[PDB]
């Protein structure tokens, strides 16, 4: 059913999507040991999950003061939105992982290292993504079907993941957080451009769908960064990812709160993972 729009507008999921869906994906609490010690995450598997099929995977980071359980807690209930959207055909089934930047030496800034070395191999060796194996080569070869996003400090995590993990991840969803690398917006954009240059990727091989609220403090620093990025040849601004690769959704009146941010995921996540996808779809 999904069709790309060129300037998608903010629309909250219906209130009914916040209540439990009978077609509920399974949420599995996992514990693993990596460079930052023994840590946990949650894995959302779509309803009907079949390990002999291959699923898109989206990693989603919490904000400051939160943890790996926040996004699927009663304070957010993202799984209800996912369940309803997948059941209604709005969102193709995918795996959603909620890790944490807490623990050991880990920070929102440096999480990408643990992500690369420990999180991807742990999750993707257990569950069925497009990664045929979880060697660096197997992960890189499946990058078009892997995404990363996050809220606030988790948005910062997302930007650091982008600049350090373009080889492994093609889709990025920074929510209400800017990239802290640089003394000006131009420095931030230039850093991203340099990462893209180093990666060798074409503009059809990475995608950024940023979002925030018009009354969300993150707008103050996101907006200048987005404008600087728009000026780069590396980005073609439009939400139609069949045509371009960069969009910034600003929700009128929304404030810095998961109550709103969950809806940004509802609006944006359906836009991910169709470019170079393996099914024959018309979007
Ligand atoms: C990474 O960018 C941002 C982070 C925050 C974090 C707020 C908090 O932890 O309370 C707020 C605005 C931002 O633009």
From Swiss-Prot:
It comes from the Bacteria. Transmembrane segments: none annotated. Coiled coil: none annotated. Belongs to the glycosyl hydrolase 10 (cellulase F) family. This is Endo-1,4-beta-xylanase Y. It comes from Acetivibrio thermocellus. The gene is xynY.
């Amino acid at each position: 059913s999904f069709k790309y729009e060129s300037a998608v507008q903010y629309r909250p999921a219906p209130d009914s999507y916040l209540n439990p869906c009978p077609q509920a994906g399974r949420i599995v609490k996992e514990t693993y040991t990596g460079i930052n010690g023994t840590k946990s995450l949650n894995v959302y598997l779509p309803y009907g999950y079949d390990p002999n099929k291959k699923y898109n995977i989206f990693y989603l980071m919490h904000g400051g003061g939160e943890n790996e359980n926040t996004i699927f807690s009663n304070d957010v209930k993202l799984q209800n939105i996912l369940d309803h959207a997948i059941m209604n055909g709005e969102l193709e089934p995918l795996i959603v992982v909620t890790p944490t930047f807490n623990g050991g030496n880990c920070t929102a800034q440096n999480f990408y290292q643990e992500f690369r070395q420990n999180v991807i191999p742990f999750v993707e060796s257990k569950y069925s993504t497009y990664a045929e194996s979880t060697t660096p080569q197997g992960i890189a070869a499946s990058r078009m079907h892997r995404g990363f996003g996050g809220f606030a400090m988790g948005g910062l995590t997302t930007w650091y993941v982008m600049v350090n993990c373009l080889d492994y991840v093609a889709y990025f969803m920074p929510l209400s957080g800017d990239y802290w690398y640089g003394n000006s917006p131009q420095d931030k954009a230039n850093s991203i451009a340099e990462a893209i240059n180093r990666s060798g990727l074409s503009k059809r091989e990475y995608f950024v769908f940023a979002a925030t609220g018009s009354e969300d403090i993150a707008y103050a620093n996101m907006n200048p960064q987005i404008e600087a990025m728009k000026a780069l040849p590396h980005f073609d601004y439009t939400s139609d990812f069949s045509k371009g690769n960069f969009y910034f959704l600003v929700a009128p009146g929304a404030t810095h709160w998961w109550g709103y941010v969950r809806h940004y995921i509802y609006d944006a996540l359906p836009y991910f993972f169709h470019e170079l996808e393996h099914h024959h779809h018309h979007h």
